[PDB]
Each structure stands twice: as C-alpha cells, then as structure tokens.
C-alpha cells in the first residue's frame, strides 16, 4: 500500500504541476503563448505519461472522482478508497506550493488577482457562464470520463492502450470545457490551486467536490448496468467462438 | 443488441458533444481560442476514445455513413443497419440538446444567428465555397474515411491500433475540410445541430445525408474489389511463408 500511495501521490503531483504550471506560466505569453489548446494538451499528457509510468503499480487514478467512480463500478475495494484520496490531495497541494514559488520569480505576479488557474462559475467563470451551465458540463464530462476509463480497462479491450485513451480523453475534456469552468473534473486539482488563491476560489470549492464525484459515480453505474457483459454473456461468447 | 445499441448511442452522443461543444464554446474565444485546429483535434479525440472504450462491444461506428459503408464492403449484416442508424441519430440529438442548454448560460448566445456549428454550402459555407466544391470534398473525404476504416480493421493489420488510425483520420478530415462545408462526413452530427439551428440548416440537411453516405459506399466498394485479398490469395501467402 505504501508503494501504491506513493505512486498516486507522485501522479497527482505530476498532473497538477504540469497542467496548472502550463496554464499559469505559458498560456498567456505574448505572441507565443500556448493558449487553451496547449493547456489541454499538457493536462492530457501529464495523465498519459504518469499512467504509462506507474499504472502497473497503483492503477493510475490521480483523481478522487476516478477512484470513487471505479468503486461505484465494482472495480475498486471500498476499504482502500480513503487512503488513495488523501494521497492524491497531498500530492496536488505540494505541486501547487512549488508552482507558487516559481510563479513568484517574475515581477508583477499576483495569485489572488490572476486567479492562479482556479476553477469557478458564474461571475468567476472565464467566459461568464451561469451556475447551471457549469453543473451540466461538469456532470456530463465526468460521466463520460468515467465511462471511457471503465471501457478502456475492460478485459476485452486492447491491452496496453488504456493510458493513451484516458490521457487523450482528459485533453478533449479540457478542450471542451475550459471556457465554462476552467475544466476541473478533478477535486484534488481544484483544491490545490484554490488553497493558494485564498479568495473566492475557496468559497466555490465545494461545488467542484460534489459535481465531479457525483458525475463519476453515474459513469460507473452506467458501465456496470448497461455495457459490461455478464458472466453468462461471457460464457456464451466463448462458446460461440469455438470451431466445429 | 441492446448492449450494442446503447454503445452506439453513447458513442454518437460523445462525438457530437465533444466536437460541436468545442466548436461552439471554445473555437472563437478571444485571444485564447482553440480555433479550427483545436476543433479538429477534439473531433478526432472523441472518436478515438469512444472506440477504445466500446468498440469491443459494438464495433464503434458512431456514424451512419460508416455503418452503411461497412455494409457495402461486406463486413456488416444488412438486418442490423437500421437499428444502428436510429441509435446514432438519437444520441446526437440528445447531445445537441444538452449543448444548447449549456450555450444558453452565456449572455448574447443566439443559435440561429451563430449557426450552432451547422454544416452548409454556398452562401452558408464558412469560406464562401460553391456547391460543387462541397460535393467533391465531401465525396472524396467520405471515401477516404471508409477506405481507412476498412484497411485498419483488416485481419492482417496491426491488432489494437485501429482506433488511433480512425480518430486521427477524422482529425485530418476536419483539418482539410472545415473551411468548405464545416466537415460533416457524418449525417447524424449534421442533423443534431441542424435541428436546433432551425433555419437554413434544415433546408440544406438533405445534402449532408446523401453525399456522405454515397461516398462511404464508394469507399467500401473500392476496398472490396481492389485491395482486399481473396481466399486463394490468402492461401497462397500462407504457403509462400512456410519454411522448407
């Protein structure tokens, strides 16, 4: 469990560092910044690389919503959930701290005024979207993310390709939802930067712990009840694929 | 069949949500929008991830043109075609509806005036291209898409790599054809947004049901008649690869 917790902590640290640092240091650079597309690519690549690196150790969740959705899908023991979550959160926080230090090396940096890549809705949405839009988008994208994770790791899916699918799914989610809420779908990532923003981000933090997790659960349930093959169905397929 | 229909519906929902939402919410964002390249990447990633997730269940078509072209290529039973198509369409519509709701959360949104990422030609083409250009581009790109799908899923192709090839092919198709017609090559995706546009999009909708499907058929025929190896050819290759 120590190995697994260390893997989850390092993975979440990598995710937060990569994505949030790309957003804070490079997204708005004059005449050469990477923009929203670059930020989405960075977020996807963090998960892809860290999955390839330590998924064989811990399973590569790096997300409390992912862990809880996998539990709801019947794929992860309940007794191990809490530990995982704690590790993830801790990792994120550490990353944020280091990021803060780095961001302080440039004149004029102000975490409170810039927002420090914090998630928000309504008046604090990047595009000025309402609370209902944020709720709908977060729910749908979390459910889709969990569905993709469940499908790609199924025993009948191509072996070894899951990290690519999951990382590119995260990139797509960011590409879709950055203008609405800043694309959290990850409570630990939201918390890590909300702590250092210190203002309105902490007031709205609860929203990004409830909506993603709920969405993840829904995703798991769907794959558990509508898409996964039952034991009898597996046996039937095996018998139907026998030469005669 | 219920599992397969659910998989197709969810896949088409994912495709429409991802691609059209990226086009509507993030493509034109000031100073940080993702642009045409970002939209093309999102469209490709939706198909890639959904294929990795549920292709082992339903085959991962998510496109009426793909289903009909696979039928014409001798790879999909006719009696199952209609069901698939219906599922796909339904999925798309649902996605569009949710997208509409989300788009309504920002002040000044107007689906009719903006076009809601609808496909069009002539006066309604993004780049002001004529009907003939739209016809030629849609035909060629649909044929190429079906050819790629047939080749990548061939029993002699590398195993497990088909989703990557198909998704990146869709991304390339968008990169090429977005300025001409908005890159439909998918009747369900066109219908989903044309319904909510409610104006000229419905007048031109027929064009994007006929041209793609026909193109797909052509693609299938080509692979069926010029590229697929016959039974005798397979036996000859097997015998030619025997040690002596």
């Amino acid at each position, epitope marked *: 469990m120590f190995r697994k917790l260390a893997a989850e902590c390092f993975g979440t640290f990598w995710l937060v560092f990569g994505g949030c640092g790309s957003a804070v240091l490079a997204a708005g650079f004059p005449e050469l910044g990477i923009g929203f597309a670059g930020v989405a690519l960075a977020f996807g690549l963090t998960v892809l690389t860290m999955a390839f690196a330590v998924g064989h150790i811990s399973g590569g969740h790096f997300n409390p919503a992912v862990t809880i959705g996998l539990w709801a899908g019947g794929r992860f023991p309940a007794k191990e959930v809490v530990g995982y979550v704690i590790a993830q959160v801790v990792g994120g926080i550490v990353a944020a701290a280091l990021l803060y230090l780095i961001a302080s090396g440039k004149t004029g940096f102000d975490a409170a005024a810039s927002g420090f890549a914090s998630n928000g809705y309504g008046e604090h949405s990047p595009g000025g979207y309402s609370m209902l839009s944020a709720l709908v988008v977060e729910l749908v994208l979390s459910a889709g993310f969990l569905l993709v994770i469940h499908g790609a790791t199924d025993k009948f899916a191509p072996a070894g390709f899951a990290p690519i699918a999951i990382g590119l799914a995260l990139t797509l989610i960011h590409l879709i939802s950055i203008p609405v809420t800043n694309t959290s779908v990850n409570p630990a990532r939201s918390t890590a930067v909300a702590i250092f923003q210190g203002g309105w981000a902490l007031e709205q933090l609860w929203f990004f712990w409830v909506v993603p997790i709920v969405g993840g659960i829904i995703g798991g349930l769907i794959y558990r009840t509508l898409l996964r093959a*039952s034991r*009898l*169905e597996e046996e039937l397929r095996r018998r139907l694929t026998e030469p*005669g | 069949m219920f599992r397969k229909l659910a998989a197709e519906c969810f896949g088409t929902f994912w495709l429409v949500f991802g691609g059209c939402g990226s086009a509507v919410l993030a493509a034109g964002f000031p100073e940080l929008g993702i642009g045409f390249a970002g939209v093309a990447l999102a469209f490709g990633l939706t198909v890639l991830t959904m294929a990795f997730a549920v292709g082992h269940i339903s085959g991962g078509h998510f496109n009426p043109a793909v289903t009909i072209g696979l039928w014409a290529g001798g790879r999909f039973p006719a009696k199952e075609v209609v069901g698939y198509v219906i599922a796909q369409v339904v999925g798309g519509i649902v996605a569009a509806a949710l997208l509409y709701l989300i788009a309504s959360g920002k002040t000044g949104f107007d689906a009719a005036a903006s076009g809601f990422a609808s496909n069009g030609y002539g006066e309604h083409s993004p780049g002001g291209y004529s009907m003939l250009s739209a016809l030629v581009v849609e035909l060629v790109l649909s044929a190429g898409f079906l050819l790629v799908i047939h080749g990548a899923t061939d029993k002699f192709a590398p195993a497990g790599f088909a989703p990557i090839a198909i998704g990146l092919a869709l991304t390339l198709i968008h990169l090429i054809s977005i300025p001409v017609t908005n890159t439909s090559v998918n009747p369900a995706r066109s219908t989903a947004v044309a319904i909510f546009q409610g104006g000229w999009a419905l007048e031109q909708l027929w064009f994007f049901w006929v041209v793609p499907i026909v193109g797909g058929i052509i693609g299938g025929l080509i692979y069926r008649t010029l590229l697929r190896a016959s039974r005798l050819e397979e036996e000859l290759r097997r015998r030619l690869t025997e040690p002596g």
Partner: nanobody
Amino acid sequence: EVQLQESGGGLVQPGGSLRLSCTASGVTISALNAMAMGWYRQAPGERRVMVAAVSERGNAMYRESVQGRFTVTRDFTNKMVSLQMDNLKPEDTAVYYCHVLEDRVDSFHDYWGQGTQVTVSS
C-alpha cells in the same frame, strides 16, 4: 429439471427459409428468466457447436459465420426460443438442438433438446 421440446425443421432447397421453435417445461418462469436460451448444431462428422443464443438480459448473440442469415428470438413469458433461418446453404445441413445454459456460481449446467434435422438439398 428442465425439459426442452423442439419443433420445425426438415427439407429445404438452397436459398429457402425455415423456422425452428423450442419450448421449455418443468421450470418456473422466474427461474428460467435467469438462464440463457440458445441453439447448437452438429453437422455430419463434426462438433456440436453453438450458433446463436439469447442471454438472461435479452441480448441476442450469433456465431460469426451465421450472423446476417439467422435471427434468434426469445419469449420470456411463454418460455419459448425460436430461430429463423434465411438464405440457407448446403453447410447449414445438420441436427439442431435447443439448449439452455444455467449459471451455478462455480460452473455452468447444460440442458439439451431432442434434436431436429435440417437438410438443404437442391
């Protein structure tokens, strides 16, 4: 135990169609709803292999070489399973058995029918 009674089948020229039916008895509807109902076939000198089935959740499954020509239907209330064969070929000549698969946690149990002859000769 479960008792399976089949019907239909016989002689048909190539390109014709046939409909086999099978009914179960000696089992309650609720108990049968948790089982899979399908069709096996044995051709002269070969294996007895499954060609089509309907699972406890109503999902129709087919063998690759027969999908597109065979249609398997299940009536849960009537405890019935039927198979419709269209565009028959010489390779379809065989003895067809109604089959029931039951899940016993650590293994599966098979219930077999009497068998019906299907001969496709021009």
